[PDB]
Structure 1
Amino acid sequence: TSQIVLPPHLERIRERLAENIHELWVMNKIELGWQYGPVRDDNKRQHPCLVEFCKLPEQERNYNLQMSLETLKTLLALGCHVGIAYQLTSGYKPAPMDLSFIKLTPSQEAMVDKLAENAHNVWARDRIRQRRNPRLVPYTLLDDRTKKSNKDSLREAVRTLLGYG
């Protein structure tokens, strides 16, 4: 995917999708019950990466930035063209819009599936340096129950990509 130059015409859309991925990274943790704290812990149900997008520094935003970049690059490599077409938290308000109404076509369904496959491939290639976790096998030999978690993680990308026009 990295061998494709990123068109700056949609760099703003890439950043919007990165902000959406970040606010959903906040949403799921807050649904679990996570607040905003200065300590990077997981059992203390707080996360220091739930603040405003502009308030986020270089040390916390490159994740979602590269997330959106690699999704769109994978779209370009697959071939489809891209162009022009409440629970109270501890300070942040993740609420872009109601993006869970319109029904996703089976193409974009399997295509978020392919995005999850690609991401799991990078993750497994990173994990092979460790010992012998049963997840070191590709996404096709992955257990069926868990596949939809990684599919939902990538579905919101095409959700926003359709909804924003």
Structure 2
Amino acid sequence: SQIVLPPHLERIREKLAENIHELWVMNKIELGWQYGPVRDDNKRQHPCLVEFSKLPEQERNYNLQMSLETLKTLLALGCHVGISDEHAEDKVKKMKLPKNYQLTSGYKPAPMDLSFIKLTPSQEAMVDKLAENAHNVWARDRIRQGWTYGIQQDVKNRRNPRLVPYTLLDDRTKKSNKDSLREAVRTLLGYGYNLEAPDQDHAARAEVCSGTGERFRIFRAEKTYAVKAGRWYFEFETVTAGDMRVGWSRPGCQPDQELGSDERAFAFDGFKAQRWHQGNEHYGRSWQAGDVVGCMVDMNEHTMMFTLNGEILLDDSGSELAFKDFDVGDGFIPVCS
């Protein structure tokens, strides 16, 4: 609402709403809706099939406002307007209509040959976000009327199943509102205004919206299973690649501390390929989904090793050992974060 429409944009706003009226005339007279004063689309009735006024001029100015808040959505997302010159405004290669795709009267739609005008993939992304915003506006307006989500439609209970996030919206309404807004962007382009696309801003939510304040879940064996001598082996299977660690920990590891951040554990972080004991150092490769890590500890000579899908992981140098100088302490138990 605080966004003010530039004069550049508003002096062609009128032609934009005119051509959206022209979109009803073309689309309805082509797909079969003939002229009808009431919106009885069931029996192919079209009230929008005539010049601005005879279809309610309040609806024509509603199209004016559709252009207004559409370009305001462009500025709110950050889509800029690009004008070269009023000669580019006058540039029209008058696109021709048969009577089937043309309205009965002389309010003839003919901007230009929109076929060759193309969209950047980023531009299509912003157009899809425009459709997103329009769908949210519609759904919230329905909420203002007092509607709600459902699986079957009941106007008595005001339960529309279509009230869902746009990602889960049904593809039929989805393609209709998409291609409609795509054509609206085509209209804006054919009236000279091209958009100098805003930079595709890069971001990431870090996938950290877990249960309350938890960030990891440490799984260890019982403290009475600690091994102080011999050679031992266990496998860790990676179902989903991500922030996971595996290794051997002392029988004093704190459940709320990240594995390897202290002296109480010896872990392998294959997400970013480090080795964790009081700090991180580059080690080994990075796993994928279904990868199996094999942890091997030999307390006789105090060494540790890791294997990804059979092959031994090595350090930055050619050393096979992952941890080679540590005391026996109270033993070690398998652990994974």
TM-score class, shorter-chain normalisation, is 0.7 to 0.9
* In 1: Cα distance, 2:8 partner to 2:121 partner: 28
Q: How well do the aligned residues superpose, as a CA RMSD in angstroms?
A: 2.4
Secondary structure of 1:128's match? helix
Q: Give the 3 Å change call, closer, same or farther, for CA 76–128 of structure 1 in structure 2.
A: same
Pick which of 143-152 and 132-141 moved more. Answer: 143-152
Q: Which has the higher strand share?
A: 2
CA drift at 1:139: 0.8
| TM-score under structure 1 length normalisation | 0.83
Matching residue of 1:102: 117
8 Å contact from structure 1 (residues 108, 158) kept in 2: no
Q: Is the 8 A contact 1:124 1:138 kept in 2?
A: no
The structure, 1 or 2, with the larger RCO (C-alpha pairs under 8 Å, 6+ apart) is 1
> CA 1:6–1:141 in structure 2 vs 1: closer, same or farther (change >3 Å)?
same
Contact 1:18–1:67, Cα closer than 8 Å, also in 2: yes
Match of 1:17 in 2: 16
> Structure 2: how far apart are the matches of 1:163 and 1:60?
23
Deviation string 1:21-75 (CA, Å, 9 cap, x unpaired) is 1110121111122222334422232222221236655322122111111110011
- Using structure 2 for the length normalisation, give the TM-score: 0.44
Quick check: 51-60 or 66-75, which moved more? 51-60
Q: Which moved more, 1:20-29 or 1:56-65?
A: 56-65
Q: Gapped runs of 5+ residues in structure 1?
A: none
Aligned CA distance change for structure 1 residues 79 and 11 (closer, same or farther; 3 Å)? same
Given that 2:34 and 2:46 are in contact with CA atoms closer than 8 Å, whether structure 1 keeps it comes out as yes
Structure number with greater Rg is 2
Greater displacement, 129-138 / 17-26: 129-138
- Give the total of aligned pairs: 163
8 Å Cα contact 1:120-1:139 kept in structure 2: yes
2:109 is paired with a residue whose SS is: coil
How far apart are residue 88 of structure 1 and its match? Answer: 6.3
**What is the rounded CA distance, in whole Å, between the counterparts of 2:82 and 2:118 in structure 1?**
21
Deviations 1:93-136 (A, max 9, x none): 32322212222111221111111111110111122356322211
Whole-angstrom CA distance in 2 between matches of 1:61 and 1:14: 12
State the alpha-carbon separation in 2 of the partners of residues 136 and 88 from structure 1: 34
Q: Is the 8 A contact 1:23 1:94 kept in 2?
A: yes
Percent sequence identity is 98
